[PDB]
Design a protein around this ligand. Structure first.
Ligand SMILES: CCCC(=O)N[C@@H](CO)C(=O)N[C@@H](CC(C)C)C(=O)C(CO)CO
Ligand SMILES: CCCC(=O)N[C@@H](CO)C(=O)N[C@@H](CC(C)C)C(=O)C(CO)CO
Ligand SMILES: [Mg+2]
Ligand SMILES: [Mg+2]
Ligand SMILES: [Mg+2]
Ligand SMILES: [Mg+2]
Ligand SMILES: [Mg+2]
Lengths: 244, 249, 204, 243, 231, 241, 221, 196
């Protein structure tokens, strides 16, 4: 027979859900986005494809914040990412309301994972067309997670998704191999800028705008803040020096 | 959301309800289970087909008590039978015992499980149950009775019958071996002999499940002091009793 | 005022040697005003008798409900309901309206067709079974009926004597109740025969 | 979504026919034959059991004839479980009418209620219809003895004599041949047994393969479901079997 | 093509064909341009007519004294979306005594539109919206697509032949971005942009709609003779 | 045609979606086994961390359902976590409503009933997971109960799940035929962990390091999971065997 | 009502009086207030008699279904939790005051449940109108480690104290003993201290004393 | 009721009486008012026995689920669950709770949830009908970072006074010591503390 890929939540004879894999195809066509877990925090970075110079620079923000300590970036269908972030914000709000403490990063990851996986159980809904790198600092330290359209999530030393996900990943691994003791927060910021500039080569036809945020226990006091101003320009210059 | 608000079991142009016939097919591939009604009790038997020898057979109990005087066995898809016995035990209380203070007659509980199965063959977004049941019971005003319930919700009373793979052969045996002067022990013996043909592997107390609806067992009641509380008529035979009755064949 | 004391009426059942007796007054009134001299409060479903005292509308409603339920019972089970089973049915039906109760006081009486044992039972408005093998009283004159039955009753009475006993109990209890009386009916029930007698009593 | 799997059971064919109703009637055409005959002083229902075996208990068996109240009975042809669902609803409606009006429900009112229940499935809900045809035999003071039939379409008709199930054409031809208006209930019993014996697919017509019922007259109406022994007696009495 | 039956089906490529068909419904719509400076924001709308006896359909909708939109595509879906935006601005004003930021309005429209691209039954909205507004952050112009993607721009155009106005604004960016405090010149730049998107037509009084919002200028719409000075 | 996409009957009386879910259970290419001791129950599982970017501590298929029940899942991690969350919820609700800790077999029956529902209702797809619950029940002792996508569930003297399931099953069958008992006659749970690791290394034919295994131990009124260091202790002690 | 429960060395006994009253009137002289929730889980009820009977029957039905589902002997703590949550839902409007005792795989257990949903644990408990008298007896005679006979005597004496000294209690004494390992022992009318003395006269009437207006046979066929 | 909870150098100690009253009648003289909602998170209950039992059962369920999902909960989290139950149901509840817990990061912690559903973190908390008679005494005698022995003595004297003056408090004095060593149960009998 055939037609197994026409509906969601339908098992193929080899045990696959083809709609989720098509969602992953939709993810891979998205812009590059990475996350680096450092010694006392996490850094998130994303490439914004400047289709034209009519786009107002520094606007059209992609990095989103959940509660005051969780940072989320996603590659794929931007609206699906916004929907997932809204659901995660509701989850964090309910968790804070009931248990007082802000939601831990693994707990939030499982909330998002159950939501995304539930979107693969019925033919009346479409799987999420985003992959999400999120994380932050809780009472147990820094946590970075990546979550797939299937609902699968894992904890990562470093994560990357989008078009330039290959190159980025390689670069990330080099980091993990070169200094296993870890990067500092600002070092991780500059390195994320470098990795986004390097992974932009798979989209070198159009110009891009770098966007970096971070959540560090020492540099941001556990809160999620956009890397802007002098530190952002410093990271951009480090990237320019690393590409040439 | 649940967009399956339509029947998944419809009439074909030939008049067949395809899903009901396919559920009956799924039953036909089930392990042989039989029932024989005597004059002083009813017997229901089946084979305890265990997939892995590492699996503990005692947990895989194919005979299930419904009321202290009504038990059940099946042929078909185990899990459907498990959820059906749970629903039957519940409906025995909600629809009868909590209304009349006494457990329901065998025919009424059988009709309730038949109603459940018929709902499964007509409600929206659901397949029929993939099992056929043999219900053996005793009530005060109908005596002992043995009923068979099909995925369609159709139920019929049998003097004796069998369902599953060896159904035809077992039923022929029973037809040529049953009489209205039969005793509970003679019925247990005939049930063992009929199972012996439908079981190719080892044939002992460990591999077969056998239960009876016979006389009341005050020792199985758990309490004494109520002369009207006679005790349960349903009794599952232990492996040792099965072996003792097998050694004398 | 009090729903069980608006219409008045009394029902009483007794057991004898292989028989039961169930009697009721005939009056239906609205407080002091007496309206109907013919309001019987005893009904029978197959061979099980049920007397209902209290709010008249609830008496009628419960009669119709139990007719409904016993007819469906006979259709599903292909046999008439037994007095003990019917007692449990009345209890469950009454308790189903635990917080919006019927203002009634039912009395079940009958011979078990399979065991031959006489059986009577009583309930309150929320269905509390009172299993008594001797007598059951209900109605506005429940205290007078209690006294009359506790004095006059002796076990294992023949029907011709159980009739006199239950009739004197009902009559003398009704004479001391303003809201009961105006006639009376007595059913003497054996296994294969049921006799219904209209008593002569004071019409005040 | 799920719209690809919806068979749409309540749609019209280009000829103005309901697919599921036609297929359920075709299903019922293979059910055991049931016959109703209305004499001047009674009604007779007879039916042949499709399910037959030496090991099938007949004393405790009710497959084709069912009591609705104390004055109305039904002969069933088709899915017995759908039939029991509808019979339960009909009994409840009859008892509702009794509680409301303190009178037994007239036969046509009950038949029409059950037919409306059947028709509902053929217009909305997206569910399959009930694969059951009914022959209602009843008595009321307004019209006397009444005989009706109802098929899965929800349509119901009134007959002097009628048959449903297998071999309905042959049975209807035989009844039209041998039916007279002024006949009594015993002649109707004989005619029903003769039609069932002439239209059966088995070798001979035995007591174990048929169910029988009579609604007759003491000034009262008595509803009798024939027992296996009574069936055997009436069979040897009408000359279909010996002893 | 078996993957364009509804919005819950991804194609093997990873595409959502119903969303693409809604975008194509936009591309068949009439042209409308939006642009902004640092003090003002202008929408120009060439409203299409069914014929010469027809009325050039209303193409610019006011959402609040500080925010409005123009539409290209299915007018009913633009009515639904504009009503939702009006209700959101109204909620902001009533509950928080706060003028709703244009960025937040774009986010709300994005979520409202995304809700229709993931559930069976129903469709994405067949409209594209140009949203202008002046708030505490200055002037703002947003482009909204049925996919849910909302992007903030200095200028853009949507509808039939919108690429002409798009490239015009791409070249004229440094010119009109500095038209601060002179609404007439900004409107003239927008009208020249929308003129760059004409093939066999020419702007007249009947087929022109203008909308302006700014520092000391609430969202105002000019229709008919009011636009004659800009032709 | 469409009878292969929803949980309805094929003409052969088969539910193809259930079979395809069973197939999906082996998608992770991880084997696991469970064995019973004198007063404990051990579960070992393979720990495959392919990406160097992965945090190995977060890569797990063993779940702490309750304080007494552990659950190892063979299948995709989304369905695994779905079933694990459902099992935790059911166990907590059971303890609340009935005042005693949920027994292992009762939780197995609950999850199996939910699986049966998924195979009978068409709107919900089956979960492509095989759930192995282990505990030391207060009434049954060491207990292993397994549930599959079909809604079937059964207890085991020992069990194994995964692609190489049959090989471990055969090894265990042979050991129990030789030993003539249905458990491991060892008093300490460490020795039972050692036994389990030894027999998995023998059946699979591959050595294991401390980063290649996941060990969950259930003892009376406790279920825990060993750290890499505790597993390293078990392996080091195995070296002398 | 007067109901008590006493734990001894190898189990628990509960006991109750057999008097049911509607105000000052004795409605039932031999009411059975010991209800079986499960074969080895019994409980005595006080308060609105209908409520006690209904709540015990409901929780027993659910406990039987639960035991069939879990294939285990029912636990007294299960019945306790179910009763307490059902009573708490109704904020005391189900006026049932129960003493629930029994034996299960975990041992012997004795608890009390009040109509508002509060539960208490103890080695000896009393409830009902005669609870204060019975409790006096218990506080005066209970000791750690009682035998089966000592506990039965103590419980019956408490019920007797309630019978003699409390107007709401009277008639006979029902007992239910539950030992660990044995079957439950339900002693109906274990004692009958109050039996009506012989009357001075037979009040049988001579037939024909009652005037009859109309007589007829009733058809029940 | 008379209940209290006192923090000290090594952890926390909860103390309660054992008297459950239905009016002037002592319905139960061996009541355990110290309820475990988690391993090292307990509570002292005062007010409606049924209400406190239901609230504690629901909090124990919530904390069991919380532990199964996210790990061991902080004492503040148990206080928050109690607070949500008491505040969102203040109209139908009569419950005063003292939640006392021990963890390694914060040592001992005491929260009090009075009527109305507010929460207050305190070095020690007193509650119940008898606590009114020991406010001055406890305020004059409590010290920060006491030893275990001095804390047991402080609780013993305070609760003995409360039992002496409050007719609704009596029976034995129960205590639960929550430290890193774990959970310790203490009992003091009338013949012991009545002569204090
Ligand atoms: C049947 C008449 C209606 C009714 O409900 N009567 C109640 C209270 O009027 C009653 O008989 N209560 C008994 C309890 C038993 C009967 C279960 C009791 O608890 C003591 C005092 O606590 C009273 O003897
Ligand atoms: C049998 C049910 C009757 C009941 O619920 N009594 C309550 C209300 O008085 C009660 O005993 N409250 C105690 C609290 C303990 C029970 C946890 C208390 O707090 C002080 C005063 O605050 C009185 O000892
Ligand atoms: Mg009078
Ligand atoms: Mg008068
Ligand atoms: Mg399914
Ligand atoms: Mg007394
Ligand atoms: Mg005191």
């Amino acid at each position: 027979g055939t037609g197994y890929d026409l509906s969601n939540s339908v098992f193929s004879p080899d045990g696959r859900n083809f709609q989720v894999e098509y969602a992953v195809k939709a993810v891979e066509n998205g812009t590059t986005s990475i996350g680096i877990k450092c010694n006392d925090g996490v850094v998130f970075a994303v490439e914004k494809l400047i289709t034209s110079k009519l786009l107002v620079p520094q606007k059209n923000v992609k990095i989103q914040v959940v509660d005051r300590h969780i940072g989320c970036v996603y590659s794929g269908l931007i609206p699906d990412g916004r929907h997932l972030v809204n659901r995660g914000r509701e989850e964090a709000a309910s968790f804070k309301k009931l248990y007082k403490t802000p939601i831990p990063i693994p707990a939030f990851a499982d909330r998002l994972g159950q939501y995304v996986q539930a979107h693969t159980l019925y033919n009346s809904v479409r799987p999420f067309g985003v992959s999400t790198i999120f994380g932050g600092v809780d009472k147990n330290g820094a946590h970075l997670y990546m979550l797939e359209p299937s609902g699968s999530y894992w904890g990562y030393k470093g994560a990357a998704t989008g078009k330039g996900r290959q190159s980025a990943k390689a670069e990330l691994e080099k980091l993990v191999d070169h200094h296993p003791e870890g990067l500092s927060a600002r070092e991780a910021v500059k390195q994320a800028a470098k990795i986004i500039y390097l992974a932009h080569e798979d989209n070198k036809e159009k110009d891009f705008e770098l966007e970096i945020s971070w959540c560090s226990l020492s540099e941001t006091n556990g809160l999620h803040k956009f890397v802007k101003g002098d530190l952002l320009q410093e990271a951009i210059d480090f990237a320019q020096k690393e590409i040439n | 959301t649940d967009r399956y608000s339509f029947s998944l079991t419809t009439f074909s142009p030939s008049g067949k309800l395809g899903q009901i016939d396919y559920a009956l097919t799924a039953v036909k591939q089930g392990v042989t289970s039989l029932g024989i009604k005597a004059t002083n009790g009813v017997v229901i038997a089946t084979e305890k087909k265990s997939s892995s020898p590492l699996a503990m057979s005692e947990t895989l109990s194919k005979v299930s008590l419904l009321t202290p005087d009504i038990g059940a066995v099946y042929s078909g898809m185990g899990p459907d039978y498990r959820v059906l016995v749970d629903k039957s035990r519940k409906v025995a209380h909600t629809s009868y015992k909590r209304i009349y203070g006494e457990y329901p007659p065998t025919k009424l509980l059988v009709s309730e499980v038949a109603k459940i199965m018929q709902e499964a063959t007509q409600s929206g977004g659901v397949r029929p149950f993939g099992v056929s049941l043999l219900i053996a019971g005793h009530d005060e005003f109908n005596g002992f009775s043995l009923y068979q319930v099909d995925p369609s919700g159709s139920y019929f009373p049998w003097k004796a019958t069998a369902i599953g793979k060896g159904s035809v052969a077992a039923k022929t045996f029973l037809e040529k071996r049953w009489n209205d002067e039969l005793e509970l022990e003679d019925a247990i013996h005939i049930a063992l002999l009929t199972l012996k043909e439908s079981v190719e592997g080892e044939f002992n107390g460990d591999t077969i499940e056998l239960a009876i609806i016979g006389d009341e067992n005050p020792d199985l009641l758990g309490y004494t002091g109520i002369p009207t509380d006679k005790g349960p008529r349903f009794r599952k035979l232990t492996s040792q009793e099965i072996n003792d009755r097998l050694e004398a064949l | 005022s009090d729903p069980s004391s608006i219409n008045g009426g009394i029902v009483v059942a007794m057991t004898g040697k292989d028989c039961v007796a169930i009697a009721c007054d005939l009056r239906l009134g609205s407080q002091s005003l007496g309206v109907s001299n013919k309001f019987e409060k005893i009904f029978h479903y197959g061979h099980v008798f049920l007397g209902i005292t209290g709010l008249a509308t609830d008496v009628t409603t419960l009669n119709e409900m139990f007719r409904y339920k016993t007819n469906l019972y006979k259709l599903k089970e292909e046999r008439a309901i037994e007095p003990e089973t019917f007692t449990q049915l009345v209890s469950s039906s009454l308790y189903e309206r635990r917080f919006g109760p019927y203002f009634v006081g039912p009395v079940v009486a009958g011979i078990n067709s399979k065991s031959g044992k006489p059986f009577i039972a009583g309930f309150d408005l929320i269905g509390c079974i009172d299993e008594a093998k001797d007598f059951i009283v209900s109605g506005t004159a429940s205290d007078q009926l209690f006294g009359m039955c506790e004095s006059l009753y002796e076990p294992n009475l023949e029907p011709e004597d159980l009739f006199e006993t239950i009739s004197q109990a009902l009559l003398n209890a009704a004479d001391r109740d303003a809201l009961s009386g105006w006639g009376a009916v007595v059913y003497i029930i054996k296994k294969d025969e049921v006799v219904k007698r209209y008593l002569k009593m004071r019409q005040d | 979504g799920s719209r690809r799997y919806d068979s749409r059971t309540t749609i019209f064919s280009p000829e103005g026919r309901l697919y599921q109703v036609e297929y359920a009637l075709e299903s019922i055409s293979h059910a055991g034959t049931a016959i109703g005959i209305m004499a001047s002083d009674g009604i007779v229902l007879a039916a042949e059991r499709k399910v037959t075996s030496t090991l099938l208990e007949q004393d405790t068996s009710t497959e084709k004839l069912y009591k609705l109240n104390d004055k109305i009975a039904v002969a069933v042809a088709g899915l017995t479980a759908d039939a029991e669902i509808l019979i339960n609803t009909a009994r409840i409606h009859a008892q509702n009418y009794l509680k409301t009006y303190n009178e037994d429900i007239p036969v046509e009112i009950l038949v029409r209620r059950l037919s409306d229940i059947k028709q509902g499935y053929t217009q909305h809900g997206g569910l399959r219809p009930f694969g059951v045809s009914f022959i209602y035999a009843g008595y009321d003071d307004r019209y006397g003895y009444q005989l009706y039939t109802s098929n899965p379409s929800g349509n119901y008709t009134g007959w002097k004599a009628i048959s449903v199930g297998a071999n309905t054409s042959a049975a209807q031809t035989l009844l039209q041949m041998d039916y007279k208006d002024d006949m009594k209930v015993d002649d109707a019993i004989e005619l029903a047994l003769k039609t069932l014996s002439k239209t059966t697919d088995s070798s001979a017509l035995t007591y174990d393969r048929l169910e029988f019922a009579t609604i007759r007259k003491d000034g009262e109406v008595y509803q009798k479901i024939f027992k296996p022994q009574e069936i055997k007696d009436i069979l040897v009495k009408t000359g279909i079997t010996k002893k | 093509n078996n993957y364009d039956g509804d919005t819950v089906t991804f194609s093997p490529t990873g595409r959502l064909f119903q969303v693409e068909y809604a975008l194509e419904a936009i591309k068949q719509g009439s042209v409308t341009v939006g642009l902004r400076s640092n003090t003002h924001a202008v929408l120009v709308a060439l409203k299409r007519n069914a014929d010469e006896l027809s009325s050039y359909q209303k193409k610019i909708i006011k959402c609040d004294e500080h925010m409005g939109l123009s539409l290209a595509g299915l007018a009913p879906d633009a009515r639904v979306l504009s009503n939702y935006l009006r209700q959101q601005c109204n909620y902001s004003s009533l509950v928080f005594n706060r003028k709703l930021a244009v960025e937040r309005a774009g986010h709300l429209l994005c979520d409202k539109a995304q809700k229709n691209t993931q559930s069976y039954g129903g469709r994405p909205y067949g409209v594209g919206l140009l949203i202008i507004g002046y708030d505490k952050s200055g002037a703002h112009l947003l482009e909204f697509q049925p996919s849910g993607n909302v992007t903030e721009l200095y200028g853009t155009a949507i509808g039939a032949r919108s690429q002409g106005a798009k490239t015009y604004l791409e070249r004229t960016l440094d010119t009109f971005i500095k038209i601060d405090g002179n609404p007439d010149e900004l409107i003239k730049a927008g009208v020249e942009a929308i003129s760059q998107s004409l093939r066999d037509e020419s702007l007249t009084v009947d087929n022109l709609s203008i909308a302006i919002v700014g520092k000391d200028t609430p969202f105002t719409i000019y229709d008919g003779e009011a636009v004659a000075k800009y032709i | 045609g469409y009878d292969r996409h929803i949980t309805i009957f094929s003409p052969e009386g088969r539910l193809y979606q259930v079979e395809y879910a069973f197939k999906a259970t082996n998608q992770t290419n991880i084997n696991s086994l469970a064995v019973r001791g004198k007063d404990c129950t051990v579960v070992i599982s393979q720990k495959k961390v392919p990406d160097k970017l992965l945090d190995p501590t977060t890569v797990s298929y063993i779940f702490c359902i309750s304080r007494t029940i552990g659950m190892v899942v063979n299948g995709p991690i989304p369905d695994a976590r779905n079933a694990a969350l459902r099992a935790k919820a059911e166990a907590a609700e059971f303890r609340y409503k009935y005042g005693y800790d949920m027994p292992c077999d009762v939780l197995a029956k609950r999850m199996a009933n939910l699986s049966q529902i998924y195979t009978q209702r068409a709107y919900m797809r089956p979960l492509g997971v095989i759930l192995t619950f282990v505990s030391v029940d207060e009434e049954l002792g060491p207990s292993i109960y397994k549930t599959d996508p079909a809604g079937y569930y059964v207890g085991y003297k020992a069990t194994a799940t995964g692609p190489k399931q049959q090989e471990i099953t055969t090894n265990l069958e042979n050991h129990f035929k030789k030993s003539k008992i249905d458990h491991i006659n060892e008093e300490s749970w460490e020795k039972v962990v050692e036994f389990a690791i030894t027999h998995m290394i023998d059946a699979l034919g591959t050595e294991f390091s401390k980063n290649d295994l996941e060990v969950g131990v259930a003892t009376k009124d406790k279920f825990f999971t060993l750290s890499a260091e505790n597993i390293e202790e078990r392996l080091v002690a195995i070296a002398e065997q | 009502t007067t109901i008590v429960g006493v734990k001894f060395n190898n189990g628990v006994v509960i006991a109750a009086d057999t008097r049911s009253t509607q105000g000052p009137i004795v409605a039932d002289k031999n009411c059975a207030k010991l209800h079986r929730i499960s074969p080895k889980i019994w409980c005595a009820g006080a308060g609105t008699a209908a409520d006690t009977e209904a709540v015990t029957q409901l929780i027993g039905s659910n406990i039987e279904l639960h035991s069939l589902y879990t294939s285990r002997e029912p636990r007294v703590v299960s019945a306790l939790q179910m009763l307490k949550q059902h009573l708490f839902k109704y904020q005391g409007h189900i006026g049932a005051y129960l003493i629930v005792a029994g034996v299960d795989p975990t041992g012997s257990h004795l608890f009390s449940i009040h109509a508002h949903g509060s539960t208490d644990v103890g080695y000896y408990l009393s409830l009902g109108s005669g609870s204060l008298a019975a409790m006096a007896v218990l506080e005066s005679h209970w000791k750690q480690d009682l035998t089966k006979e000592e506990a039965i005597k103590l419980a019956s004496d408490a019920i007797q104290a309630g019978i003699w000294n409390d107007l709401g209690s009277g008639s006979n004494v029902d007992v239910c003993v539950m030992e660990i390992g044995k079957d439950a022992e339900y002693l109906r009318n274990y004692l009958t201290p109050n039996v009506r003395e012989e009357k001075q006269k037979s009040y049988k009437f001579p037939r024909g004393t009652t005037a009859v207006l109309k007589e007829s046979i009733v058809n029940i066929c | 009721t008379s209940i209290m909870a006192v923090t000290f150098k090594d952890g926390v100690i909860l103390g309660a009486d054992s008297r459950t009253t239905t009016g002037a009648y002592i319905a139960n003289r061996v009541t355990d008012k110290l309820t475990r909602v988690h391993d090292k998170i307990w509570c002292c209950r005062s007010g409606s026995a049924a209400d406190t039992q239901a609230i504690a059962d629901i909090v124990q369920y919530h904390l069991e689920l919380y532990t199964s999902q996210y790990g061991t909960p902080s004492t503040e989290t148990a206080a928050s669950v109690f607070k949500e139950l008491c505040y969102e149901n203040k109209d139908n509840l009569t419950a005063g709770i003292i939640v006392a817990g021990y963890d390694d990061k914060n040592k001992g912690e005491v929260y009090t949830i009075p009527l109305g559903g507010s929460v207050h973190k305190l070095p020690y908390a007193i509650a119940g009908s008898g606590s009114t008679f020991i406010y001055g005494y406890c305020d004059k005698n409590f010290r920060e970072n006491m030893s275990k022995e001095e804390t047991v003595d402080f609780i013993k004297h305070s609760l003995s006074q409360a039992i002496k003056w409050d007719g609704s408090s009596g029976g034995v004095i129960r205590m639960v010591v929550l430290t890193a060593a774990g959970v310790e149960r203490l009992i003091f009998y009338p013949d012991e503390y009545e002569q204090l």
